[PDB]
Amino acid sequence: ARREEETKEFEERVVTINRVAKVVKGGRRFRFTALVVVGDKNGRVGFGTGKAQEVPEAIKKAVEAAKKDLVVVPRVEGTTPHTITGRYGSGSVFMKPAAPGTGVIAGGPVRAVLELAGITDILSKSLGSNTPINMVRATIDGLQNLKNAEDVAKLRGKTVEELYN
Amino acid sequence: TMTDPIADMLTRVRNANMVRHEKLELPASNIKKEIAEILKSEGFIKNVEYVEDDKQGVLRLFLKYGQNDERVITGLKRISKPGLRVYAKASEMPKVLNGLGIALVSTSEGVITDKEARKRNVGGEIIAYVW
Amino acid sequence: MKQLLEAGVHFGHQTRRWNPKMKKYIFTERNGIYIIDLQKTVKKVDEAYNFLKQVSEDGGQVLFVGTKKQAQESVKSEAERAGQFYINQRWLGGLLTNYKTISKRIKRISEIEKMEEDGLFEVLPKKEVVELKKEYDRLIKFLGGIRDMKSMPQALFVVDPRKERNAIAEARKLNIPIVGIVDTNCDPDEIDYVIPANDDAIRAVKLLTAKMADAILEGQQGVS
Amino acid sequence: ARFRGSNWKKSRRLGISLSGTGKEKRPYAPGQHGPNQRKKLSEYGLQLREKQKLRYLYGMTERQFRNTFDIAGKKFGVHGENFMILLASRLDAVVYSLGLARTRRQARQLVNHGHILVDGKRVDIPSYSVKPGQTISVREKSQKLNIIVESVEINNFVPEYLNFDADSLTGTFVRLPERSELPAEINEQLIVEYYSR
RNA sequence: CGUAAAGCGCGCGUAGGCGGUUUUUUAAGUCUGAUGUGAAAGCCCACGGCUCAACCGUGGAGGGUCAUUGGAAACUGGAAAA
Numbered sequence: 156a157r158r159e160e161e162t163k164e165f166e167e168r169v170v171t172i173n174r175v176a177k178v179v180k181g182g183r184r185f186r187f188t189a190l191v192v193v194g195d196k197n198g199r200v201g202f203g204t205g206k207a208q209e210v211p212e213a214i215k216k217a218v219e220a221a222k223k224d225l226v227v228v229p230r231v232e233g234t235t236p237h238t239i240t241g242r243y244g245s246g247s248v249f250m251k252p253a254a255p256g257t258g259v260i261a262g263g264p265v266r267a268v269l270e271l272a273g274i275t276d277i278l279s280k281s282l283g284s285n286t287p288i289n290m291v292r293a294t295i296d297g298l299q300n301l302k303n304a305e306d307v308a309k310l311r312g313k314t315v316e317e318l319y320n
Numbered sequence: 321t322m323t324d325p326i327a328d329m330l331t332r333v334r335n336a337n338m339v340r341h342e343k344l345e346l347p348a349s350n351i352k353k354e355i356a357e358i359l360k361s362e363g364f365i366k367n368v369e370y371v372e373d374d375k376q377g378v379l380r381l382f383l384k385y386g387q388n389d390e391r392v393i394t395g396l397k398r399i400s401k402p403g404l405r406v407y408a409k410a411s412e413m414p415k416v417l418n419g420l421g422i423a424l425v426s427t428s429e430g431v432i433t434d435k436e437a438r439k440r441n442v443g444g445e446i447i448a449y450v451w
Numbered sequence: 452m453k454q455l456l457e458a459g460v461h462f463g464h465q466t467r468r469w470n471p472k473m474k475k476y477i478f479t480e481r482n483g484i485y486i487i488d489l490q491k492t493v494k495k496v497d498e499a500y501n502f503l504k505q506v507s508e509d510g511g512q513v514l515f516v517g518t519k520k521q522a523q524e525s526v527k528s529e530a531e532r533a534g535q536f537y538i539n540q541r542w543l544g545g546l547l548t549n550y551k552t553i554s555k556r557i558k559r560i561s562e563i564e565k566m567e568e569d570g571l572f573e574v575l576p577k578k579e580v581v582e583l584k585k586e587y588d589r590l591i592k593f594l595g596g597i598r599d600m601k602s603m604p605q606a607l608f609v610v611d612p613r614k615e616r617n618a619i620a621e622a623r624k625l626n627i628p629i630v631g632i633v634d635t636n637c638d639p640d641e642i643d644y645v646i647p648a649n650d651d652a653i654r655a656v657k658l659l660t661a662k663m664a665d666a667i668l669e670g671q672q673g674v675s
Numbered sequence: 676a677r678f679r680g681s682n683w684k685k686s687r688r689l690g691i692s693l694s695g696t697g698k699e700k701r702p703y704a705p706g707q708h709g710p711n712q713r714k715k716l717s718e719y720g721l722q723l724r725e726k727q728k729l730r731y732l733y734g735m736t737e738r739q740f741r742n743t744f745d746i747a748g749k750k751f752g753v754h755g756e757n758f759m760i761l762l763a764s765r766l767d768a769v770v771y772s773l774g775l776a777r778t779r780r781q782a783r784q785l786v787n788h789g790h791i792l793v794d795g796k797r798v799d800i801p802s803y804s805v806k807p808g809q810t811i812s813v814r815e816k817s818q819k820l821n822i823i824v825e826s827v828e829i830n831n832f833v834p835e836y837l838n839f840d841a842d843s844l845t846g847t848f849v850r851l852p853e854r855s856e857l858p859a860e861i862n863e864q865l866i867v868e869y870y871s872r
Numbered sequence: 873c874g875u876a877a878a879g880c881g882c883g884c885g886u887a888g889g890c891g892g893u894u895u896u897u898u899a900a901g902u903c904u905g906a907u908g909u910g911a912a913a914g915c916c917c918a919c920g921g922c923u924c925a926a927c928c929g930u931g932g933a934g935g936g937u938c939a940u941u942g943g944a945a946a947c948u949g950g951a952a953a954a
Contacts, residue, residue: 156548157624237418252418256753258864260871266718275864300394307420310384310392311363320419323891349893351946376893402890405948407902428903428944443903445947742925749917766924796923803924 159222163195167218168271170264171287172210189213190288193221196273201225202291226295229303233275236304236320240282241297246289247282248297264290325349326398326448336383337391342366347377354431355424355447356381362422364392364450393421398448410443421451452662453496458489461648461655464635472639476647485635487647499630499644500666506606506628507670514600515660516618518542519610522656526610527595529660533667536600541593548621550603557598563587606630608663611650612637632659678734678780689728691859695778722869725862732859733767734780739802744870755863760852766793766803769811772857773839773846774831775823790814790823805848813844832858 169191176185186206191214194200203221207213229236238251248265253276259269261279264287269277281290308315322328329352336344346352348370356379359365366384371377384392400406408414408425413434416423423434427444437443466484478488503513517526517539530537538546546553563583572580607622609615609631619641622629630644632655639645649655682695684705692698703710716724730740747757763772770782770791782801789797792812793805805811813823827841834857836850854860 157626237420256755256863256867258868260868263718302394302420304420307392308363310386310390313363318419321891325892347893354946400947402948405901407947409903426946428946430946432946441904442944445902447947739925793923798923800924 156223158225159219161222163197163199165193165222166196166271167191167193167214167221168267169214170267170291172213175206187213189217190291191217191221192268192271192291193218194271194273196271198228198230198273199225200228200268200272200295202295204288226299228272228298229301229306230272230274231303231320233273235274235277236302239297239301241293241295242283243292243296244284244289246284246286246293248290248293249280249282250297251278252276253278262290263287265294268294324402325352326401330396330398330448334396337393340385340389340391342382344381344383345378346380348379349376351426351431351447352379358422358424358431358433359450362450393451396448396450400446400448405445407445408443410438410441413438413443413446416449417451421449424448424450452500452666453493455489455493457658458492458648460652460658461489461492462486462652464649465651467636469636470639473635473647476633476635476639487633487635487649492647495645495647496662499646500663502628502644503606503608503630503663504666504670504673507667507675508673510675511606511667511670512536512600512602512604513667514538514604514607514609516542516609516611516615519614519650521651521653522610522660525653525657525660529657529664533664534671535667536597538595538597540595542615542618543593545621547604547607547618548624553600556594557600560590560598610656612641616641632656677736678783682731682734682780685727685731689724691728693778693859694732694734695780722865725866726869729762729861729866732779733762733765734783735802741870755867756853758867759854759857759861759863761804763852763857764805764848765801766791766798766805767801769805769837769846769848772834773811773837774827774829774833775844775846776826777831781822781826785822790817807848807850809848811846811848818844 169189172187172189174185175188176183178184186208187210188204188206189210190202190204192200192202201221201224203217203219203224205213205216205220207216232255234252234255235250236252238249240250241248255276257276257278259266259274259277259279261269261277262281265279265281268291283293284290304315304319308318329346332344332346353368353370356365356368360368364384365381367382369380369382371380386392413425414423415434424447425432425434425437425444426447427437427442429442431447434446463484463486469485476487476491478486480486503511506513513533513535515526515530515535515537517523517537518541523539526539527537564587572584604627606628607619607630609619609629611632611634612619613634613636616638619629623641628644629642631642631646632650633639633642633645633647634650635647646659648659683697686693686695687701688704690701704713726740730737743762744758747754747761750757762768766786767779767782770776770785771779776782776785785791786801787799789799790813791798792814793803794809795812797814818824823844827844830841833839834852836848836852836856838847838849839845850856
């Protein structure tokens, strides 16, 4: 799925909609769609999508698949640990942490994302493609390949506070 | 003909991480063993064991992995490479990945991590990031 | 459990093509065919036997696939012996990741059958009775006699990966304990709990279904 | 055009009390099409609506508002806080937030007048930046007209970073405030994002 | 830079660019320290005055592929030996 939990708080939030067609002889059968992200803005977020003949159906189905895929998102000081670049299918992306008091600076979709994972001050510029989907998949690809000081110094035989960001 | 040894070492290393078998072989050199000791001091390595025969090498390494088998680095590369050599001061140096990884560097007094190079206020010729 | 003279029984696998992941299991290839080594196998049997036994300590629930032939007679048999639900044939789309339907499925069973009491067969005309009888028989058939999974599984046992690779991946979405027999020509790291021994042989599979039926049964008559 | 507007219709749009003036019809929104359903909100509308929701507070304008914002761009600690406190460490605020009025504009016509005396000195501009280690007074000539002591008498409120002497009409600024010391609290992040694009 | 614009038809070879290992040395490159200079005004930071601001001043830091000079030798470089 993997492991939707409906137990935390939630804030569904919508990114787009298309009107998408399948032509069969005679008419043009088309099916509105939408992407969604869902998080607690307290340490959990993930996307979800679906298609239907109508919006409420689509968005709801999207949300039922939305909770089913998640990332833990190691956050620190209301901020991400460090800077990366995400990449997936030419929808590259670049983040960087910040002096606080800034507020998230980025584009529409990615703003809706990180605003829903409870991150406060961070800097970015989207890159490569402007398509809404693989943008996000870039984001969560990077956040899935991301670490905090406890995630690491465990591995290395030494320990934090001779080393820290 | 090998234009560069850094490529040999770091590429056999990455190619060995993507496949996850522990041990690995390579012809030796002065700098290679120096930095390999640093990586052992990082924690990115378990162990090394030198061995000798006609004439160089083989600097044999045994790599390290979690119990859940996550690769301990994510990434790697040099910087100071042929054609465009590069340098940096003691003040100017980078703090990679705001503090997690490292940036190997050579000094007038030896090859070291970047941290000892800013504490000492001695810069030098950078070699490689790793993180 | 295991003893090495029970591992003098297990022999060989198929020799068409073989995962290079699994040379570590090999003792050495001879007579034109690959074998697995056995000294490790006993350790792994101990560890896994112990694991599934622990899953039965907590009041566990477990599945048996027999969709592979030359196994099924031992699958419902050793499963019904242990007293856990089973399958020995068709794994239709979803039974571990399509939960929302299985309710309707076994509920279809409990629905149609009882009406054989209040007057069903040859009280309604030729056209329906002939339909429902066949629906019932094929239902039980390509399902099996399972009607009992009411809380969805928390561990699985299986006859063979490379046939049921689909179903075990449907477990992989459910990040569960998987365990089962390992022909040397199957995805090794697709399961956390290998049992590196042959699958084709009747005595091998009977022995493994037998002992694992025993470990389960112990853990279930273990205070659950 | 610092202030010549109704200034109620604005607070009818945004969903805040003031300003102004006073406190039915507020569940609606302005205009012919007003009462009905309307557009949704973009992200832009939120940070923007926040901006105006701080702008018509002090009645000021944008070119002054920005210049404030980026003189907060110099100093250390967080940013939006410094913009708030420096925006409410002004002369109109230290007047009305001391309780010498019923609204924010009463202070403005009080000080263009020159009635108050920053450190015992005539000043005609509400755009002064008030500081600690000061007094503030009322041109003792005029501490008895209809408006003032009509307003002085009631204890509207007092923050602990302001002192006050109702007998003397003497305030004096005390500590660096924060929003947790300043009512009419906000979000800062949304408005700082607005001056990105 | 397979197919979307984009690898010459292919070769011989000059000039140039890049260069295996160990040891010893040199100090041009490099790093570091200092002396001078890098006008003033301006930019940025701190302060004070024009009622505040603009503005003005003060003082700070800042800036060179810069010259001179004392130190370090792992790396590039030159010389020598294997």
